[PDB]
Every structure is written in structure tokens, then in C-alpha cells.
Amino acid sequence: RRLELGEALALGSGWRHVCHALLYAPDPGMLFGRIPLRYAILMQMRFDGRLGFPGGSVDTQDRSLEDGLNRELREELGEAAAAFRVERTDYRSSHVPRVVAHFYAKRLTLEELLAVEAGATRAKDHGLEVLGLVRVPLYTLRDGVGGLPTFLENSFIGSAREQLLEALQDLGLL
Amino acid sequence: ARRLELGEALALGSGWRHVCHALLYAPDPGMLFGRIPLRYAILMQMRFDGRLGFPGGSVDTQDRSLEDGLNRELREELGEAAAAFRVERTDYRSSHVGPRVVAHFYAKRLTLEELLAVEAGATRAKDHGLEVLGLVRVPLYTLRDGVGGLPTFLENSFIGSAREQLLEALQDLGLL
Ligand SMILES: [Cl-]
Ligand SMILES: [Cl-]
Numbered sequence: 001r002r003l004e005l006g007e008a009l010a011l012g013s014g015w016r017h018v019c020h021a022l023l024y025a026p027d028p029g030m031l032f033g034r035i036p037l038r039y040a041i042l043m044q045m046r047f048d049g050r051l052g053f054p055g056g057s058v059d060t061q062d063r064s065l066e067d068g069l070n071r072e073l074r075e076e077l078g079e080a081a082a083a084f085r086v087e088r089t090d091y092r093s094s095h096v097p098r099v100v101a102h103f104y105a106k107r108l109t110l111e112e113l114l115a116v117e118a119g120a121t122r123a124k125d126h127g128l129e130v131l132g133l134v135r136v137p138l139y140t141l142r143d144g145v146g147g148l149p150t151f152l153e154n155s156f157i158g159s160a161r162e163q164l165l166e167a168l169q170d171l172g173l174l
Numbered sequence: 175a176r177r178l179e180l181g182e183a184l185a186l187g188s189g190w191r192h193v194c195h196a197l198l199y200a201p202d203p204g205m206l207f208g209r210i211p212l213r214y215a216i217l218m219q220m221r222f223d224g225r226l227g228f229p230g231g232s233v234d235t236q237d238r239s240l241e242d243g244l245n246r247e248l249r250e251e252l253g254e255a256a257a258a259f260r261v262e263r264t265d266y267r268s269s270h271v272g273p274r275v276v277a278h279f280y281a282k283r284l285t286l287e288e289l290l291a292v293e294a295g296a297t298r299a300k301d302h303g304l305e306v307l308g309l310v311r312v313p314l315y316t317l318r319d320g321v322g323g324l325p326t327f328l329e330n331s332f333i334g335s336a337r338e339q340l341l342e343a344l345q346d347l348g349l350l
Contacts, residue, residue: 031222031304040303045220045310047206048317049327117308118297121290127215127311128206132293134220134308141223151224154330 001095008100015098019069020053020160021086022105022167025113035139038173040113043160044076045131052157053103054130065091065102076130078119083112092167095159103163136164138173175270175335183269183276184240190274194244195230195336196261197281197343200289206315213314214347215289218340219251220307227333228279228340229256229306240278251306253299255291259284267343270335279339281346312340314349 008017027037046052054076058068066087073081086106095101108116120126120133137147152161168174183192202212221227229251233243241262248256265282284292296302296309315323328337 027303029303037303042308047313048322049313049324049330050322051330114297117302121293127202127204127212131313132308132310134310135303137222137224137307146223146225148224150331154224154226155326 003094003096003100005091005094005102008094008096008102011100015096015100017058017065017068017100017102018056019058019065019072019102019104020055020163021069021073021090022053022103022163023108023113023116024105024167024171025108025110027110031137031139035141038138039171040110041136041138042113042116042133043136043164044133046157047129047131048157049131050155050157050160051134052160053163055104056129069102069104076123076125077116078121078123078126080112080115080119083115084108093163095163101158103159105167138168175338178269178271178276180266180269180278183278186276188235190276192233192240192243192276192278193231194233194240194247194278194280195228195339196244196248196265197228197267197279197340198284198289198292199281199343199347200284200286202286210315210317213349215286216312216314216340217289217292217309218312218336219309221333222305222307223333224307225331225333225336226310227336231305233278244278244280249299251299251301252292252309253295253297253302255288255295258288258291268339277334281343314344 024039024041027040029037043051044054054073055069056072062068069086086104090104090106092105093103137151140147140149199214199216202215204212218226231247237243245260261280261282265280267279267281269278313323313327317323
């Protein structure tokens with residue numbers, strides 16, 4: 001299932017790689033003035049009706065995983081994604097058809113993150129591979145179901161659900 | 175989700191909340207992977223509660239009609255761009271009733287250019303990042319595996335009867 005980046009960097013041509021990024025930004029915002037949002041975190045509704053992360057396939061044209069991640073993101077998200085670069089320091093995990101899924105996480109400013117939302121419609125893949133961007137609600141509502149717990153009952157691509165949870169875990173959100 | 179006629183629903187007493195939601199759609203000729211027809215761009219939204227639904231909201235006695243209230247909530251939910259059309263009584267579709275809420279549904283044909291400006295602008299709506307977590311188009315196809323596209327979309331969590339309201343409008347749009 002899961003493996004080391006070197007372990008997977010080491011692999012024959014019978015494997016290709018994908019790169020995906022969880023973009024996040026602190027948020028002092030408060031739903032209804034009462035419920036702290038904590039962080040804005042983007043996901044995308046994909047062409048198959050499943051929730052996933054931005055990025056995509058890295059191919060022989062790329063000098064590295066990050067060059068392919070950042071290229072995929074310019075195309076999926078638009079020009080606001082070139083305000084920053086995802087680097088190896090933002091890498092998190094690799095997972096295994098015959099595909100290795102690399103996963104990254106990049107802290108943005110709320111301002112940067114908002115610019116990415118604002119420009120996402122003009123992106124090439126908008127209204128095609130990507131049906132739109134959504135933020136992950138990080139709270140649980142007063143009924144004990146609304147919010148994250150219900151968000152987590154949606155359809156997710158691949159291992160995106162588990163990537164999400166691990167990263168939230170690692171943000172101190174359980 | 176027991177149904178109501180619009181007149182009856184309007185007759186209901188001072189102890190009911192009324193909500194109004196709108197399915198905004200334009201025809202779209204494009205093809206996914208240049209081979210799979212989109213047919214229409216139809217807007218839905220990810221709500222604060224992690225459920226998919228339609229733009230709209232509460233309507234109160236301070237609204238001179240359900241329509242005025244819907245256009246007001248549409249402006250809150252999606253921004254300036256939505257002011258460029260009014261959703262009127264002719265676009266009305268159905269009303270449903272738990273806790274003395276009545277929920278009214280509209281469907282409104284926009285021009286593809288109008289629908290885009292709505293998405294382009296939604297990041298500036300008051301509710302964006304609050305009640306509205308972002309917009310999404312409904313995928314109307316089913317993909318070669320017979321599960322991706324629409325039928326997987328339908329397995330996501332929906333608020334109220336948005337699934338039913340959606341499915342209803344797709345049927346009335348003539349989609350099998
Ligand atoms: Cl490589
Ligand atoms: Cl009228």
C-alpha cells in the first residue's frame with residue numbers, strides 16, 4: 001500500500017507516478033461567528049464526481065516530481081499557482097494498475113490561497129477534468145454529523161481520503 | 175420529503191420558515207476528452223455542512239415574495255454576477271416540507287456566458303468560505319466503466335431533497 005520515496009523512486013518503467021498537493025492556509029474566520037474554521041484547505045470535484053486533490057500525472061518530459069507537480073497545478077488551478085512552488089520539503093507520502101501516488105502539502109497565506117480560488121475558473125481544465133474547488137470543513141456541527149464527518153462520507157478518489165486524514169492528524173486536528 | 179402545492183405552501187402560518195433554492199443551468203456543447211458530451215453546465219455547491227446542494231437560503235417576512243428572497247440569497251451566495259438575471263415565478267419548480275420548514279425549488283435557464291461569470295465571481299460572494307465552500311458543476315454523463323460521472327456524483331452527501339430536485343430537473347430536461 002504505502003512506501004518510501006526512495007523505494008518508489010526506485011522502480012522499473014512498469015510504474016508511472018502521480019503528484020497531488022493539499023494547499024492550506026490559516027483562517028481566523030468563524031462560521032456563523034461562533035465556529036472556528038482554523039484552516040482553509042482546497043480539494044477539487046473531479047470529472048468522475050469524486051473528491052480529490054489538484055495535480056496529475058508526471059511524464060518523461062519532467063526534470064523531477066516537483067516540476068511535474070507544479071506544472072500540473074498551473075494547468076489545473078491557473079496563474080495564481082505560479083505565486084508559489086511546491087518543493088521536496090512539502091512531500092508527505094507515497095502510495096500504491098501500477099501507479100505510485102505522491103502526496104504533498106504546502107502552507108499558503110490565506111491571501112495566496114484566495115487568489116488560487118479566484119482564478120481557478122480560467123484554468124485550462126476548468127469545466128472539464130475539474131468541476132470546481134471546495135474547501136474542507138474542519139469542524140463538526142452541533143448535531144455531531146454536519147461538517148467534516150459528513151464531508152468524509154462523500155466519494156473520494158484513490159487514497160485522497162486517507163491523505164486528507166493523515167494531514168489533518170499532522171496539523172493537530174485529529 | 176412530503177410535497178406541497180405553491181398556493182397551500184404560501185397559505186401556511188407565521189410559524190414556518192421558508193427556504194428557496196435555484197438550479198442554474200446553461201446549455202454546453204463541449205466534450206470531456208473531446209469524445210463525451212457535457213450537454214449543460216449545471217451549478218451546485220458544497221455547503222458548510224459538507225453536503226452538496228443548490229444556491230439559496232432563508233426567506234422571511236422581510237421579503238416582498240419568495241422570488242425577491244431567492245434573488246437576495248443568490249446574491250449573498252454567488253455574488254454580483256447573479257444580479258444580471260432574475261429567477262422569477264415562471265422558473266419555479268416545486269415545494270417540499272421536518273421542523274416546519276418549507277423548501278422551494280427553482281430552475282432557471284442562463285446563457286453559457288452568464289453561467290461562467292457566476293463561477294468566475296463566486297469567490298467574492300459574502301457566503302464564500304462560510305456557508306459556501308465552493309461551486310461545482312454536475313457531471314451529467316456516465317463514464318465507460320458505468321459508475322464514474324453522474325452516478326458517483328449521486329453517491330455524495332446531499333442536503334434535504336436536492337438529489338431528488340436535481341434528478342427531477344434532469345428528467346424534465348429529457349435525460350433518460
Ligand atoms: Cl522522473
Ligand atoms: Cl411572474
